[PDB]
């Protein structure tokens, strides 16, 4: 077959970015943070004064999106039109806009080739919502990482508190349920586990346990 792919799909703040990175490093494979692409698209829209409420306006922006990634240094660098926007795209505001633009079918379609371009040997670890169901349906290894909304909001609260940012549980939880609801209820490419995906309920599993479980499954399936 062509290059193998390990997909990691799941709700917001489920630890997909962390797990994807750890696996790609352990296996020495390529990585794809798909969510980062929707976030950069949303950011580009604000900069270029594109109406996020209009699918017609967003299609051109998506079709000609100039986004690139750089890593293998300890963290992922997201580049928009030649500028590092790694930090700028990690906010609730951008996340919200990314989820809104992601609901448009024509926009998602315009981004398919770009994502699928990431499949290269020796392999690709793809993190997102519809990686195992729409972007890479023939993936030999599909993982669906999940955890309760309450736990996922709690983990985010602690991450922001470490950095000294103002937050309160009620908002973070509401924000998370709001975004996940949209992603799971949209008519096209909704967040849903692939029939053949291994579901990892990590509410009470540590980071290292998840990594160990995900790697065992992939190695058995791939070899
Ligand atoms: N494969 C993907 C990755 C992200 N997304 C969208 O992008 C938003 C932001 O994703 P991340 O939180 O994973 O960065 C999600 O809420 C979702 O609406 C998607 O629809 N399909």
**Domains of the chain from N-terminus onward:** 1-223 (3.40.50.300)
Q: Are 139 and 132 in contact (CB under 8 A)?
A: yes
How much distance in Å is there from the Cα of 122 to the middle of ligand 1? 25
In sequence order, the β-bridge partners of residue 147 are: none
Query: Atom 11, ligand 1: which residue's CA is nearest?
Result: 35
- What is the arrangement of strands in the sheet containing 198-201, beginning at the earlier edge strand? 30-33, 124-128, 5-9, 141-146, 198-201
List C-alpha distances in Å: 113 to 96, 109, 135: 24, 8, 9
Query: Atom 16, ligand 1: which residue's CA is nearest?
Result: 99
Phi, psi angles (nearest 5°) of residue 127: -110, 130
Tokens of 42: 């949303």
Q: What does DSSP say about strands 77-80 and 83-84: parallel, antiparallel, or unpaired?
A: antiparallel
Burial of 163 (0-12, 13-18, 19+ CB in 10 A): exposed
> Strands, DSSP E only, in the chain?
5-9, 30-33, 67-70, 77-80, 83-84, 124-128, 141-146, 198-201
Tell me, using a 6 A CB cutoff, whether residue 13 lines ligand 1.
Answer: no
Residue 33 and residue 12: Cα distance in Å, rounded? Answer: 13
DSSP state of 66: -
Q: Are 143 and 9 in contact (CB under 8 A)?
A: yes
- The two most distant CA atoms of the chain are separated, in Å, by 49
Residue 127 and residue 189: Cα distance in Å, rounded? Answer: 14
Angle at 17 between CA 13 and CA 18, to 5 degrees: 100
Would you mind telling me the total number of residues written for the chain in this entry?
Answer: 223
How much distance in Å is there from the Cα of 28 to the middle of ligand 1? 24
Pick the closest to residue 9 from 160, 144, 188, 153 (CA basis). 144
What is the gyration radius of the CA atoms in the chain, in angstroms? 17
Could you give the angle at which helices 169-185 and 92-101 cross, rounded to 10 degrees? Answer: 10
Contacts of 71 (CB under 8 A, 6+ apart): 31, 77
Experimental method: X-ray
CA 197 to chain centre: 16
Tell me, using a 6 A CB cutoff, whether residue 100 lines ligand 1.
Answer: no
Tokens of 33: 């943070």
Q: How many helices (H) and strands (E) does the chain have?
A: 8, 8
- What is the arrangement of strands in the sheet containing 83-84, beginning at the earlier edge strand? 67-70, 77-80, 83-84
Pick the closest to residue 193 from 97, 112, 128 (CA basis). 128
Residue 104, SS3 per DSSP: coil
Helix residue ranges, H only, 6-142: 16-27, 34-47, 55-63, 92-101, 105-116
Q: Are 44 and 61 in contact (CB under 8 A)?
A: yes
Residue 71 and residue 77: Cα distance in Å, rounded? Answer: 6
Tell me, using a 6 A CB cutoff, whether residue 4 lines ligand 1.
Answer: no
Residue 15 assigned as binding residue: yes
Residue 33, SS3 per DSSP: strand
CA 193 to chain centre: 14
Q: Are 48 and 150 in contact (CB under 8 A)?
A: no
Pick the closest to residue 4 from 121, 82, 103 (CA basis). 121
């Amino acid at each position: 077959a062509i290059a193998p792919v390990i997909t990691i799909d799941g709700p917001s703040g489920a630890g997909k970015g962390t797990l994807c990175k750890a696996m790609a490093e352990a296996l020495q494979w390529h990585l794809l943070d798909s969510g980062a692409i929707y976030r950069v698209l949303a950011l580009a829209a604000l900069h270029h004064h594109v109406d996020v409420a209009s699918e017609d306006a967003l299609v051109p922006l998506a079709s000609h999106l100039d986004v690139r990634f750089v890593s293998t240094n300890g963290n992922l660098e997201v580049i928009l039109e030649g500028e590092d926007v790694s930090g700028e795209i990690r906010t609730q505001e951008v996340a919200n806009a990314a989820s809104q633009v992601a609901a448009f079918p024509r926009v998602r379609e315009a981004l398919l080739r770009r994502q699928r371009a990431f499949r290269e040997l020796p392999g690709l670890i793809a993190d997102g919502r519809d990686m195992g169901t729409v972007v890479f349906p023939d993936a030999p290894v599909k993982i669906f990482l999940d955890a309760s909304s309450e736990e996922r909001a709690h983990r985010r609260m602690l991450q922001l508190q470490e950095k000294g940012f103002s937050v309160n549980f009620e908002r973070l939880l509401a924000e998370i349920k709001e975004r996940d609801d949209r992603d799971r209820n949209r008519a096209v490419a909704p967040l849903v586990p692939a029939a053949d995906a291994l579901v990892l309920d990590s509410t009470t599993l540590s980071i290292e346990q998840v990594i160990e479980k995900a790697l065992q499954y992939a190695r058995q399936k791939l070899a």
